[PDB]
């Protein structure tokens, strides 16, 4: 199938540069144009422009000239967006979006998006604490166990349980933004109270901006 | 540059129609109007192109039309999964693309539901790092309004409290979380800490002790 896979989220300081990749699979890359779309947090979609994969020529929307470069590496079926002289207002999720034939003004396939956070603040990986259920708390049929993902920056964090094999009864909550400036979030999975002692539970916490992944085993109290 | 109303609403089974007004130089000039559906934190998905056409996999419940300078998307037979943001787009005589500002569609009629509350005490491990945090997780409530209060023993506490604003769950119910930051001696010096969640005048309470 036609697929667009984008690079991971990044933190960058003001005035720095960032390059986001959009790797195409499942079709002839040089046959269809690629568009770029920006979405600031809580805001709407903005079209940035397009690049022809036949000529390599980019065309930029009026609001996105000067600091934005569309480029290609056809030998690895990849389109690139480079942002230079980064500004605070550049903080956004960026999408590559394929131009459907015959003219490319319909976006039929989209990359999953890349969060670029522009800030001078230092990166901080999370501290991950496993939350075990007390014995009293397992007195009913089920028990709720979890992981506290504390004091990180920037977004985002992904949480899975047992490397993605355990998804039912999982509720990962949106992060809180603390006065300190750092984020924290929690994830909880409810399991049968009978399976504690037999089945191992591990939270996998990924923080791509710091390229750090931690797996904690939730053990007994 | 394209004008959409900020919201839309309908009951399960009924229809909603969302407008998208441009100019004679885009919506009224050409037949390349698109509609995209976006769930929170996911990529936009094409649902209508060339004003009225549907891509593979999109049922005819979704229909598009236009008249003059305004394009319209109609979702008939509304279902809960239709709750999402909807964006129109159009080609321009300047050889550009413009988007509308987006319309948030909510499906109504959901019954009142009280919050479920889970409250975790600080771990040994956190305490060891002189960093205790009480974690109060609130889920499956509707409508999406809650107030949270923290109690130390029997008395109120408000410093070192962090509470999210409610967010929609994937089942269109609401969730929130609240964190009480303490110190290890703040923790052990009390008999119990409590998180109390009030929703439509009624409260769900959880308590933990060292």
């Amino acid at each position: 199938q036609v697929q667009l896979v984008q690079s991971g989220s990044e933190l960058k300081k003001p005035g720095a540069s960032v390059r986001i990749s959009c790797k195409a699979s499942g079709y002839s890359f040089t046959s269809l144009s690629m568009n770029w779309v920006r979405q600031a947090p809580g805001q709407g979609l903005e079209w940035m422009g397009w690049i022809s994969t036949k000529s390599g020529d980019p065309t930029y929307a009026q609001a996105f000239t000067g600091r934005f470069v569309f480029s290609l590496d056809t030998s690895v079926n990849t389109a690139y967006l480079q942002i230079n002289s980064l500004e605070a207002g550049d903080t956004a999720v960026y999408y590559c979006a394929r131009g459907q034939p015959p003219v490319g003004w319909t976006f039929d396939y989209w990359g999953q998006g890349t969060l670029v956070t522009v800030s001078s603040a230092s990166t901080k990986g999370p501290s991950v604490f496993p939350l075990a259920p007390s014995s009293k708390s397992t007195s009913g049929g089920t028990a709720a166990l979890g992981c506290l993902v504390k004091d990180y920056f920037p977004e985002p964090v992904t949480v899975s349980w047992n490397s993605g094999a355990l998804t039912s009864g999982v509720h990962t909550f949106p992060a809180v933004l603390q006065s300190s400036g750092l984020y924290s979030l929690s994830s909880v999975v409810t399991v049968p109270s009978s399976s504690l002692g037999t089945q191992t539970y591990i939270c996998n916490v990924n923080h791509k901006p710091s390229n750090t992944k931690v797996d904690k085993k939730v053990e007994p109290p | 540059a394209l004008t959409q109303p900020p919201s839309a609403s309908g009951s399960p089974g009924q229809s909603v129609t969302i407008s998208c007004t441009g100019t004679s130089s885009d919506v009224g000039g050409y037949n390349y109007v698109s509609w995209y559906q976006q769930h929170p934190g996911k990529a936009p998905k094409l649902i209508i192109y060339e004003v009225s056409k549907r891509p593979s996999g999109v049922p005819d419940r979704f229909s598009g039309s236009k008249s003059g300078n305004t394009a319209s998307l109609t979702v008939s037979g509304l279902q809960a999964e239709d709750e999402a943001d909807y964006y129109c787009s159009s080609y321009t005589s300047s050889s550009t693309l413009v988007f509308g500002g987006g319309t948030k569609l909510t499906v109504l009629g959901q019954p009142k539901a009280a919050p479920s509350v889970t409250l975790f005490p600080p771990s040994s491990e956190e305490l060891q790092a002189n960093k205790a945090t009480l974690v109060c997780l609130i889920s499956d409530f509707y409508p999406g309004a809650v107030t949270v209060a923290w109690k130390a023993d029997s008395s109120p506490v408000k410093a070192g409290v962090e509470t999210t604003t409610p967010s929609k769950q994937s089942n269109n119910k609401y969730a929130a979380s609240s964190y009480l930051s303490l110190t290890p001696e703040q923790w052990k010096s009390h008999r119990s800490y409590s998180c109390q969640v009030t929703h439509e005048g009624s409260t769900v309470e959880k308590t933990v002790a060292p």
Binding site: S31, L32, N35, S52, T53, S55, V103, G104 | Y91, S95
Partner: peptide, 6 residues
């Protein structure tokens, strides 16, 4: 009249 992006 509509320009082909390629």
């Amino acid at each position: 009249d509509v320009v082909n992006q390629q």
